[PDB]
Amino acid sequence: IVVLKEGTDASQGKGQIISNINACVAVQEALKPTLGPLGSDILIVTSNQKTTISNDGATILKLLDVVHPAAKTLVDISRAQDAEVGDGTTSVTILAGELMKEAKPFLEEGISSHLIMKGYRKAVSLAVEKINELAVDITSEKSSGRELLERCARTAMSSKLIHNNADFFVKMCVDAVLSLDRNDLDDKLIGIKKIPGGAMEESLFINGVAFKKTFSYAGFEQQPKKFNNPKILSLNVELELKAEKDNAEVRVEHVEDYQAIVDAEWQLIFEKLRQVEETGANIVLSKLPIGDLATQFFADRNIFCAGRVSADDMNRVIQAVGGSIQSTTSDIKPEHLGTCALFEEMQIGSERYNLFQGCPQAKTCTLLLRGGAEQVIAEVERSLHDAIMIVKRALQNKLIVAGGGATEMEVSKCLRDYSKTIAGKQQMIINAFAKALEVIPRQLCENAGFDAIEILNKLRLAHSKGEKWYGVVFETENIGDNFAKFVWEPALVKINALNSATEATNLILSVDETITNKG
Amino acid sequence: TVTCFVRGSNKMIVDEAERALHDSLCVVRNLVKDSRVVYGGGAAEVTMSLAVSEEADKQRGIDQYAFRGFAQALDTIPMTLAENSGLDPIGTLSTLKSKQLKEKISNIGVDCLGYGSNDMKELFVVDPFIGKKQQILLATQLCRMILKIDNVIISGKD
Amino acid sequence: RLSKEARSMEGVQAFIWQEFASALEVIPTTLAENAGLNSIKVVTELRSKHENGELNDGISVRRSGTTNTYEEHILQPVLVSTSAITLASECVKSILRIDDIAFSR
Amino acid sequence: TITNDGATILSQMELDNEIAKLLVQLSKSQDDEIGDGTTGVVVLASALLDQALELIQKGIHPIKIANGFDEAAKLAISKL
Structure with missing residues (x-):
């Protein structure tokens, strides 16, 4: 008359471990085409009815949100990679996947999950020692600062729509990172804005913040457009009297006041505009509309206004000009004002836009992308992002390893070499671990359209001869010295990615039961 | 500024003839800009x-x-x-x-x-x-x- | 040859001749596949090599690639190739002319 | 309503096929930028994809197709 479950689920046994692996591989398969500079883009439709297009593994997996209780481990560890390193999230899942793929036949042959995990833990320690030994401490040796960073961005942009126009965009990326604080380089300080029209090589670098110029209302444009040494004021409130959308009723205690209410509202806006004049601003920003009365008043006071500014831009303006945003106009002090070396209006995109330039207080910059289509501009942004990251990392962290799979193959070699002396079941696991390391140069070749079999075989022979920096060349289908070619990434990327991939591997493999409470 | 005034015996006639000007305006726009x-x-x-x-x-x-x-x-x-x-x-x-x-x-x-x-x-x-x-x-x-x-x-x- | 000669043809004949020339490639394509070779690679190498050669370039399973057909002794009597062209064309003619089938008993 | 405006037709075509949406985005760019080729850019893009299908089936990697089409476009404009 009694039961144990009443809708309570639990599943235990080796079959559950294999089931966990299969679900986790599915995540790998979603992300495997994103590896490499020629990685493919994935189309995700979100519940908000917006579509996301990206080959960024972090973007894809964060949006995927795999439900399976075990596969979610790959999501967590990828987020750890995204927080601790900032890159390599694609390679962490791929390496974790292949290690679990090899764990499956080991489980079938009767090898316990402990023995599999134990060998992996040893194999990682062996690999990490090699990765450190392979690391190079190099900065401007036989070069200079901009010379390295130029080569770094130029490499990132290879074989992109802006390949021939690299001479223009590479400078933007190098300048963008060098315009930041040299002690803490934060990608969030580099803004990217899309402006349709024009050719890609006509893109512009701005030290301050650009605006979208949202004005179409009759009577605008009749205000000064250029300032040499402006003071900048930002408000959180609107400066308009009668909008093209809104309205109001008139209610009075006396008939004579009927007309007064219309003029009283005029005074209320005027007095707010007057207190701005008392502050001594030259340019006045607002996230909310600024109307005709404000423009006519400000223009006659030699003040420029721009309203309806994106919330993200208003914060960045303050970060550019060194001032402080205020909601009211009565309580404003001159210490709330920023300063620029120039205010100007640009013709970028064959349409006028407002911008600040040469802000002495700036910690940020703005990159303006031009092009004949939004899809192309999106490709430029993605190319700039990767170029910015490699410039940032090359400037920030001098301890590097060769990319392009070169490190994975050198690690693979030393892992196989160790297996020559490792006896017993541990020999089987150290071999499988080394095998997993090869998936990276493999999927790099496959995603690039290369003959992966030929390239992998040549890479194995090259490293066997002591050519420890050779990897996958993506410009010519061959192998070559990725160190000499400046295909770098910080050593910590390979150390943390390999540690993280194994941690997820062992945590998933360690689970012999799933319990789910339903109702 | 100019306004293009379109007439016609029905809504669909005016709408289509009016939109026809849009296309022609795009053509002459491009011809002026790039010869x-x-x-x-x-x-x-x-x-x-x-x-x-x-x-x-x-x-x-x-x-x-x-x-x-x-x-x-x-x-x-x-x-x-x-x-x-x-x-x-x-x-x-x-x-x-x-x-x-x-x-x-x-x-x-x-x-x-x-x-x-x-x-x-x-x-x-x-x-x-x-x-x-x-x-x-x-x-x-x-x-x-x-x-x-x-x-x-x-x-x-x- | 037919791909270039088709350039002197007009109308439906020019387009059909190009389709005929393409159909011929099923043989060197199949030979490359069965020999374990990359299909496009082998056919592409042959097409380019026939810029200078005529019959000396073909697939050798002994050498596993595109090599000298004469030095490898890869020879076929004219009648065999000639018959394959004729009979295959006659079969296609016969098949395309069939618009119906009826029972007769 | 009755029209032969490809830009209006594609705008009124309401679909959840993400690949088809990409074609609509193409027609939007051409409609704003030039205002002429709103039908041709989608028809031609389809024609290129139709060729890509056969090329993929014959063993030409999608990337090799993309690169070849790009270079072919450069030749097409160079002659234009």
Whole structure:
């Protein structure tokens, strides 16, 4: 008359471990085409009815949100990679996947999950020692600062729509990172804005913040457009009297006041505009509309206004000009004002836009992308992002390893070499671990359209001869010295990615039961 | 500023004639901005198709397949103009390519307008250069936009 | 040869001749596949090499690639190739002419 | 309503096929930038994809197709 479950689920046994692996591989398969500079883009439709297009593994997996209780481990560890390193999230899942793929036949042959995990833990320690030994401490040796960073961005942009126009965009990326604080380089300080029209090589670098110029209302444009040494004021409130959308009723205690209410509202806006004049601003920003009365008043006071500014831009303006945003106009002090070396209006995109330039207080910059289509501009942004990251990392962290799979193959070699002396079941696991390391140069070749079999075989022979920096060349289908070619990434990327991939591997493999409470 | 005043015996007549001005305004807009023009009627696609086809044989490598394919894709435009006109697209395209090889590369159009003959030089069917340039480049970029998609995941709609 | 000679043809014949020439490639394509070779690579190498050669370039399973057909002794009597062209064309003619089938008893 | 405006037709075509949406985005760019080729850019892009299908089936990698089409476009404009 009694039961144990009443809708309570639990599943235990080796079959559950294999089931966990299969679900986790599915995540790998979603992300495997994103590896490499020629990685493919994935189309995700979100519940908000917006579509996301990206080959960024972090973007894809964060949006995927795999439900399976075990596969979610790959999501967590990828987020750890995204927080601790900032890159390599694609390679962490791929390496974790292949290690679990090899764990499956080991489980079938009767090898316990402990023995599999134990060998992996040893194999990682062996690999990490090699990765450190392979690391190079190099900065401007036989070069200079901009010379390295130029080569770094130029490499990132290879074989992109802006390949021939690299001479223009590479400078933007190098300048963008060098315009930041040299002690803490934060990608969030580099803004990217899309402006349709024009050719890609006509893109512009701005030290301050650009605006979208949202004005179409009759009577605008009749205000000064250029300032040499402006003071900048930002408000959180609107400066308009009668909008093209809104309205109001008139209610009075006396008939004579009927007309007064219309003029009283005029005074209320005027007095707010007057207190701005008392502050001594030259340019006045607002996230909310600024109307005709404000423009006519400000223009006659030699003040420029721009309203309806994106919330993200208003914060960045303050970060550019060194001032402080205020909601009211009565309580404003001159210490709330920023300063620029120039205010100007640009013709970028064959349409006028407002911008600040040469802000002495700036910690940020703005990159303006031009092009004949939004899809192309999106490709430029993605190319700039990767170029910015490699410039940032090359400037920030001098301890590097060769990319392009070169490190994975050198690690693979030393892992196989160790297996020559490792006896017993541990020999089987150290071999499988080394095998997993090869998936990276493999999927790099496959995603690039290369003959992966030929390239992998040549890479194995090259490293066997002591050519420890050779990897996958993506410009010519061959192998070559990725160190000499400046295909770098910080050593910590390979150390943390390999540690993280194994941690997820062992945590998933360690689970012999799933319990789910339903109702 | 000017306002284009459109009249007509019904709503759909005014709406279509008014929108017709939009298209014509775009044409004259582009002609003012960029004086360079090419002849239309599919003649440009045939000339470009022939050039790509002749160059394809010079590749001697794998790319030859894509270069020939690209040219064949261009052919679909003058063939579509034939089919939508009630013309044989095979006889039409054969004539278009033959005239531009046997006589002169000069643009040879199609009979889609019901005129006495082709050879748009005397017929005044002209497209702006920037228009045809963007048409080819943007269509190619879009093809790449789709070809590079190896995985699509679709959720619900809230 | 037919791909180039088709350039002297007009109308449906020009397009069909190009399709005929393409169909011929099924043989060197199949030979490359069964030999374990990359299909496009082998056919592409042969097509380019026939810029200078005529019959000396073909697939050798002994050498596993595109090599000298004469030095490898890869020879076929004219009648065999000639018959394959004729009979294959006659079969296609016969097949395409069939628009119906009726029972007769 | 009755029209032959490809830009209006594609705008009124309401679909959840993400690949088809990419074609609509193409027609939007051409409609704003030039205003002429709103039908041709989609028809041609399809024609290129139709060629890509056969090229893929024959063993040409999608990337090799994309690269070849790009170079072919450069030749097409050079002649134009």
